[PDB]
Design a protein around this nucleic acid. Structure first.
Lengths: 327, 327, 327, 327
DNA sequence: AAAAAAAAAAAAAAAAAAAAAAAAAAAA
């Protein structure tokens, strides 16, 4: 049984059970590539996160796994991104601004964070724009550094407690859609760190102001806090199934319109039941708000010039208990 | 668990099943706004429709739901509408005339009723005009009062049995399209009631005569009963896919032309298969008619001055069995 | 379940699949009218084309369909058409000359054949003129007799292999446009047959010479074979978007000009992308021709007296492989 | 106890134990139909495979079983198949070419072989195309002739040792899916034989070249040998759970994408655990390859014209030991 | 059953409507 030697960082330990057997996996970063390895219980407790190691691996029982480890020792993050870098789809690190993050409405697990990043145009000037980092739940939970996340409430806590704080993003895969839509993405070997600025630098916060968003066409995602009435009328048309919504911020009336479809792997009855549960939840939401049982934040895809289209990106509910209801 | 108290009408009880669990929803009208609440089985059987209630609600298990109820007790309907009211898009009640209702041709569920209402112009005179209340199937089924509807056959029965009868419309949202097109719409908290006139008043039926329609430009929807031949030739042109139809009423030859398109969420093969099923159905329709197996009613958008355009709005089939084939 | 009995020809069997179910349709000609019927798999294989049948039909499961069939047994074609017959828009049969057929340039499926027919004027003399039978692809594929067509290559093969041959046209609906434009059209129950003359009669081929065309105003469609250079310069003007083309036949320089518009159901980006793909295809066409990779036939609407207007009707490409590129 | 007499081939003897009792079954081919019979231990050892017999059967103890047997004595295989034969779903024999066979990725037992067969089109010419014979493990093990198979390693040995060899297929049920997908299937009474050509005929091997595959739409399954890096990034989207894979053949970079779903009889935790085991296996696969511990063959559903879709059909691992790891 | 499938932006709807010839544009 020949062995291998490898030096690399660790990212996140994980355990699981299959047919009355226990597997312990370690997500070691080797040569800037994520590779998972098997380990024992002492390996599970002993190893700490984000600290590099040296390992000997022996291919026993069909699998590579950790035989022995030795503690070892080992960051520069770009403050801007070039248009050509987004074109080239090159993995990168960044210093960005974490605005706010919501669970995409009517989606099981695909959360979405909003980041302000300094984009450098073809001319060469750097300005702060908006980007939308989608991510599944587990990748987000295992990607946050210096935090421990087990359920959606923990994720929402780590979001809200960190609102407006400055994030260091490690190995966020930038990508460029078919049209001129630019967005980050959170890869397995990627990580997020709260920089804990405490006004360490203030000369940069002037730059981090968003006038447009480069992930959508002429639209920006903004957060509103629902103050008063929340009317939500379903409207089934010949083609679409809209949710025409009108609500009251602290400043202005807002007229949004959620949309609906049947996903390809859905049935006529499952989709209809899910939609009617959504509708009853929205209907009860107004009475819940007026009596201060819950508070509601609506992150909507507004178009400041043309308010004819204001599709809600996602709704979230901060309850009196303290748990967060995704919705 | 703090509680709320609310007095309001009930509209329609409903039950559903999600992953081996039962949800019972009640569509309570609170402060002239539809709000749905959860309930138990005894709540489902005990409560009757259209009868108001007093309720105590307690926010348990993420949801508002009915804890206890107390029977309580509690209509003026406008006989006309103002042009400015259509402009303002104000919800309203009405006394209208139910001409006839058809399932929009080549549409899964968006039925359409035809109503005669007394419109008051800018001058101030009231005359009877035509309006087109579209609605999805379930809203129609839950909106009819003193009727029980479970399937399309029940809906068509409630329509045909009520032809030419006078309807009281509660909270029908009037609306005004981009151009001078005016139409009703059936909101969640809206209802329809057969007034059961029995010639209670006849001095008003003189007014309810339609010379034009305010939902289309210079066109009126009329019902014809197909007597003789029903020729239906498909004609695929450079731009359109017409269905040139010629048929025989009890009075006159009619030369209509159905149209076709691919809806945005459709494929080149699904649309083609749907169209060829439509074509084979129309082709068999003539032989079906001539042998008295079925009877056919064609509601067409005629223009009495200019018969160059007679797009069929919808076809319906009354079979020998008694069921209604939408088509 | 009462039944019907009917004797009629069959035209074309067809099969299709809808949500994991199979429909088999037979296009039976009953009383000189096309009617489609449903059938089973043995019905699909057993029945042969163009051979009449006797059928018993029973209205089961919402649909007329074939229960049993019995083999049965059963043409005079007019050699001329009267001006009044074109005026009256009367369906008719004909003996005509198939010149050539092209896919209308920049059109998804509306092919167009060119026929020489003997028109009888108001005076009473019969002379050979040109007519333009448009047709969608599937009607053409199902309309050719003694041929099997599945894709555009088969259609082009059936055209080119039959060039200059004499066609018997069954039930071609003649029609007369708003102005003095006369054209055939290919109805569902219509058919085309290669007569296979083999110089059966030659005294008639003297008549079949076209001096004008009755589907256009003073213009005739003619086929040219591109020999040398094919220059194609786009020219976007204040109103039109021309494609000024100059090419070299075996005899003469030709200066055509294709035109462009946005169809009503098109977008500013889709139309522009389609146009630039057309332009790159035309630009590469010259280099393709000069190296004998493909051969090109241009059917253009020439006006022999006035060459100031020579709009190309359609281009077609015979490749080295043998497949036909519509363009 | 009346008895029966029957003459038929034998296919595969089998033994099993139920509650401390032994059952011995013989898969006798009677009148080209598989029928299983019970027997005794001497029956188990005495009878040889593929050799016909005469048997007397007596219905004792609820079951037909072999009382006595007498040795007896008894093939023409079609070299082509007609399109109509695939349409008719008729069992058939064939002479085909065994390309390669893999265990369908993420499937417990449904292996899949790839065969080149001479299809005769509607025109009448015979050309070599690709077909995909799925089969469960035990049917494959009992279907191979002149081979003994007990575990997956034996099956993979019988595959790889027989790569590119010519197979005689007995009673392979051809079938035709809803769309134009044509595929073989391995029935109980079906068998496979290595013909052992040894260049017996070479004039036919020119025909056996695959340009397309008739079991998929415009795609062909091909085998690649992974030479260098094997990157496998999981990507959980709003709808799909892709495994975007990039690897290095001996010639070209390849960008495949495995897909994932929850089968209907699966749970949210079992599916997630299975997927994360798949992901850790793929992650370790690269390090395994680079150190020559294992070799990897990826059979992928490529589309040569459009590489935008390259779903891996199946991965297989040839280890240094000699055993084959299915994966 | 097995093939197919990059997502993730963008989206008021719902009236209206024979088509298919014709045409050089740009000055004034």
């Amino acid at each position: 049984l020949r062995t291998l030697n490898v030096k690399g960082q660790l990212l996140t330990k994980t355990t699981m059970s299959i047919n009355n057997e226990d597997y312990y996996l370690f997500k070691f970063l080797v040569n800037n590539k994520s590779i998972d390895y098997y380990g024992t219980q002492t390996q599970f407790f002993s190893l700490i996160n984000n600290k590099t190691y040296e390992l000997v691996l022996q291919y026993s029982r069909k699998k590579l796994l950790i035989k022995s480890y030795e503690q070892c020792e080992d960051m520069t993050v770009c403050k801007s991104v070039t248009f050509q870098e987004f074109c080239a789809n090159e993995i990168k690190s960044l210093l960005a601004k974490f605005l706010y993050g919501f669970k995409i409405y009517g989606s099981s697990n695909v959360y979405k964070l909003v980041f302000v990043i300094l984009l450098e145009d073809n001319n060469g000037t750097i300005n702060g724009v908006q980007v939308e980092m989608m991510s599944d739940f587990k990748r987000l939970s295992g990607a946050f550094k210096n935090h421990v996340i087990e359920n959606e409430n923990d994720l929402f806590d780590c979001m809200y407690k960190s609102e407006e704080k400055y994030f260091n993003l490690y190995r966020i895969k930038c990508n460029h859609n078919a049209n001129n839509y630019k967005s980050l993405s959170l890869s397995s070997n990627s990580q997020l760190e709260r920089l804990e600025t405490d006004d360490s630098m203030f000369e940069y916060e002037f730059q981090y102001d968003y006038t447009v968003n480069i992930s959508r066409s002429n639209k920006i995602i903004q957060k509103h806090r629902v103050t008063g009435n929340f009317t939500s009328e379903r409207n089934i048309y010949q083609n679409s199934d809209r949710f025409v919504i009108s609500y009251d911020t602290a400043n202005e009336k807002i007229k949004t319109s959620i949309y609906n479809r049947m996903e390809n792997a859905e049935s006529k009855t499952d989709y209809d039941t899910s939609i009617t549960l959504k509708d009853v939840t929205l209907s009860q939401l107004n009475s819940l708000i007026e009596s201060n049982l819950v508070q509601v934040d609506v992150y909507l895809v507004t178009d400041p010039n043309n308010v004819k289209n204001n599709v809600i990106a996602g709704i979230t509910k901060i309850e009196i208990d303290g748990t967060y209801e995704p919705l």
